[PDB]
Amino acid sequence: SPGIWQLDCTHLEGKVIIVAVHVASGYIEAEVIPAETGQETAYFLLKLAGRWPVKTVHTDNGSNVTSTAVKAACWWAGIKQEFSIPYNPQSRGVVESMNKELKKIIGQVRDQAEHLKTAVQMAVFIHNHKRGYSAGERIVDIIATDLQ
């Protein structure tokens, strides 16, 4: 489906790095966050939905994901929270693979930037616009096709 996403967090350099993955296209949206708090996770979710059609988000059952803010955000935007990744191994592998590959790219360009923040955005660019087609191409196709 075109509106299914997976919000998880992978740590690096003693930093948090939030990671949202369009499951259908594999397109990724990532950003270094101060800490795995609820408001930070919610801001990220509010923005992703304000840019893409977000209808369901598969979270991990953590404290940040069950935060009152994340609930308010999922309600105000119409996002259906589903703590499924912790109990579905088929969905677990997806978040696992994307996080490690994103981690690989983040290292390949880490020396090209002093801060991790910039390094991850450079890594996101690489992942989405590189490859059939690239991830950023698949998601626009997925969405526009559904728009029939």
Ligand X SMILES: CC(C)CN(C[C@@H](O)[C@H](Cc1cc(F)cc(F)c1)NC(=O)O[C@H]1[C@H]2CO[C@H]3OC[C@@H]1[C@H]3C2)S(=O)(=O)c1ccc2nc(NC3CC3)sc2c1
Residue 68 binding result from ligand X, a second copy, none, given CB thresholds of 5 to 8 Å by partner type? ligand X
- If phi > 0 it is left, if psi is from -120 to 50 it is alpha, else beta; for residue 85 that is alpha
68 binds ligand X (CB under 6 A): yes
Least Cβ distance, residue 115 to ligand X (angstroms) = 7
In the chain, beta strands by DSSP E:
4-9, 18-22, 28-31, 56-58, 80-82
Least Cβ distance, residue 28 to a second copy (angstroms) = 9
CA nearest neighbour of 12 among 134, 124, 100:
100
Q: Smaller CB distance to a second copy: residue 88 or 115?
A: 115
Q: Which stretch binds ligand X (CB under 6 A): 70-78, 93-101, 129-137, 138-146?
A: 70-78
